[PDB]
């Protein structure tokens, strides 16, 4: 329920997380969700991103209504310091 923002500096083209979901998937009610955080992702976020967080936005792009491919493309096509708006699982 809590909304919070994280800032993650991409290395090796990676946020160090994996995501599931999309309006046309069976995951929850169509949102984008953090499925795993690998130690690189924990480091980039100073421990603040967690499995089960819903990803609401990437920088200026809202993920409302995104398909899985749209969310992945949005997450991939950015660099340097990435801003994520999240909702606690």
């Amino acid at each position: 329920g809590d909304i919070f923002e994280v800032e993650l500096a991409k290395n090796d083209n990676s946020l160090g997380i994996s995501v599931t979901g999309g309006v046309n998937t069976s995951v929850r009610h169509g949102g984008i969700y953090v499925k795993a955080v690998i130690p690189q992702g924990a480091a980039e976020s100073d421990g603040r991103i967690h499995k089960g967080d819903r990803v609401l936005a990437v920088n200026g792009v809202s993920l409302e209504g995104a398909t899985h491919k749209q969310a992945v493309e949005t997450l991939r096509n950015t660099g340097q310091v990435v801003h994520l708006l999240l909702e606690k699982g």
Partner: peptide, 8 residues
């Protein structure tokens, strides 16, 4: 049932 996981 079935879902896709994508590392980013």
């Amino acid at each position: 049932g079935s879902y896709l996981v994508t590392s980013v």
